[PDB]
Design a protein around this ligand. Structure first.
Ligand SMILES: C[n+]1cn([C@@H]2O[C@H](COP(=O)(O)OP(=O)(O)OP(=O)(O)OC[C@H]3O[C@@H](n4cnc5c(N)ncnc54)[C@H](O)[C@@H]3O)[C@@H](O)[C@H]2O)c2nc(N)[nH]c(=O)c21
Ligand SMILES: Nc1ncnc2c1ncn2[C@@H]1O[C@H](C[C@@H](N)CC[C@H](N)C(=O)O)[C@@H](O)[C@H]1O
Ligand SMILES: [Zn+2]
Ligand SMILES: [Zn+2]
Lengths: 294, 122
């Protein structure tokens, strides 16, 4: 199947427009696993496939790109995804990563502790989150919207994300937020992307592409998660890493996206268009200051 | 892993400690971050982007650094790690122990290739 050669599946508008109740997620191949190349952590493939999909998105890619990576650590004390980001991003990009527990990584800055301790002084260009709270596995009653780190992430999008920046935030059947789905409406475009390397999980990356700061689409977040689940339940996904055979074009395009400072009054239509096409970032151009607070 | 790491934490020569442990049959440090690459690179030792050839594998720099992995002082006079934030090419016959290989070899000065593993300066 041709889809086996893609990095994964992106939620189609066919399911975005449905109106269904939230159902349980039942994947035919649930938790089945695919062998990886020898010694290669599965998260290498997961992050590479995510990056391959973002290569088809209108990502703003400036010099000194500001990237922050939450949930970058693991129980092995290492940071495979951060290394993929180092491989994927421009050499002059700044990676700040973070995790509750201690780890070591190839990021420029590494902050230990709860993501709420991470104080971002300036606006960033790209937010990756792979955070998941272990208590989410205690399924007791109804699957309701979750707070946890999503509160922090929602406030980040509203205050610390450049106009034109993008986010990729991990959700699962039970690890999701109404507010975060709603905020996808403030980007030029959005989807949920499921890697083929982990297609047997309800995991998906909630993607917001090119932040606009105003509401482009009014999204009922509770209903949209139900559509996401309806899509997962309707769509056969074969586990695969075939897309990683040809890595000749893996690196993120060096777009040289310009960074402008503008007042809200000066945005108008040309600027909005440039932001929506991944051709412009609006934010400060100072020195990035991302530290841990008390 | 915790055995050899806590071992190199009870000595003034961590490099010798690790090498004597794995030369005596100890299990190499696991969970080094092996990357998937095109075997197209120049093949140098340390590089901002992966540079594996068909005979090499690329590893995340921090993950093959003993001083990074064990959270102990780096020996570099500048205090800055030579590997962290970069990528390290390992001969493929040596992937059983990337950390041991890096502790046992040095990149050349003129050319940035591993002495004996690509350096053709003689
Ligand atoms: C999707 N799903 C969920 N459940 C049930 O609902 C519970 C919670 O569902 P979930 O939201 O955790 O979704 P899912 O199980 O798909 O997530 P998965 O375990 O694949 O985890 C995805 C990612 O979350 C992160 N993660 C999961 N657990 C942890 C953890 N404990 N600590 C840190 N990260 C974690 C990792 O990145 C992991 O790859 C499941 O543990 C199971 O009882 C299912 N049961 C059947 N029979 N078929 C299913 O398809 C199914
Ligand atoms: N509130 C939080 N703040 C920072 N990290 C968190 C928080 N909650 C959960 N996490 C992290 O979410 C991470 C999930 C891991 N599976 C991440 C894997 C990692 N991204 C990799 O590349 O292997 C765990 O390491 C958690 O410690
Ligand atoms: Zn180091
Ligand atoms: Zn030489």
């Amino acid at each position: 199947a041709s889809a086996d050669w893609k990095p994964g599946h992106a939620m189609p508008s066919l399911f975005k427009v449905q109106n269904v109740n939230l159902e349980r997620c039942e994947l035919a191949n649930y938790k089945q696993s695919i062998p990886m190349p020898r010694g290669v952590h599965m998260n290498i493939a997961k992050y590479m496939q995510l990056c391959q999909y973002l290569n088809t998105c209108t990502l703003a890619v400036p010099a000194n790109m500001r990237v922050i990576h939450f949930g970058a650590g693991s129980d092995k004390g290492i940071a495979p995804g951060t290394s993929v980001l180092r491989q994927w991003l421009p050499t002059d990009a700044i990676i700040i990563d973070n995790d509750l527990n201690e780890f070591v990584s190839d990021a420029d800055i590494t902050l230990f502790g709860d993501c709420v301790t991470v104080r971002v002084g300036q606006q960033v260009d790209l937010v990756i989150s792979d955070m998941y709270d272990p208590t989410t596995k205690n399924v007791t009653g109804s699957n309701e919207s979750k707070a946890l780190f999503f509160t922090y992430l929602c406030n980040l999008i509203n205050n610390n994300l450049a106009l034109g920046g993008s986010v990729a935030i991990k959700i699962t059947e039970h690890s999701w937020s109404v507010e975060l789905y709603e905020l996808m409406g403030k980007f030029a475009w959005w989807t949920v992307f499921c890697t083929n390397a982990n297609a047997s999980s309800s995991e998906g990356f909630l993607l917001g592409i090119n932040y606009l700061g105003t509401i482009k689409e009014n999204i009922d977040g509770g209903a949209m998660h139900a559509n996401y689940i309806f899509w997962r339940n309707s769509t056969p996904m074969n586990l695969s890493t075939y897309s990683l055979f040809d890595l000749s074009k893996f690196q993120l395009k060096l777009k040289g996206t310009p960074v402008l400072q503008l007042k809200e009054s000066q945005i108008n239509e040309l600027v909005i268009s440039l932001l929506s096409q991944g051709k412009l970032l609006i934010r400060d151009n100072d020195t990035l200051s991302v530290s841990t607070d008390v | 892993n915790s055995s050899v790491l806590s071992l190199v934490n009870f000595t003034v020569d961590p490099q010798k400690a690790y090498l004597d442990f794995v030369n005596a049959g100890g299990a190499p440090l696991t969970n080094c971050v092996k990357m998937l690459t095109p075997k197209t690179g120049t093949g140098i030792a340390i590089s901002v982007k992966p540079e594996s050839t068909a005979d090499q594998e690329t590893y995340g720099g921090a993950s093959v650094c003993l001083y990074c992995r064990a959270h102990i002082e780096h020996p570099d006079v500048s205090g800055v790690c030579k590997y962290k934030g970069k990528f390290v090419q390992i001969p493929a016959q040596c992937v059983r122990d990337p950390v041991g290989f890096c502790l046992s070899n040095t990149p050349c000065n003129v050319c940035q290739y591993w002495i004996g593993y690509g350096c053709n300066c003689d």
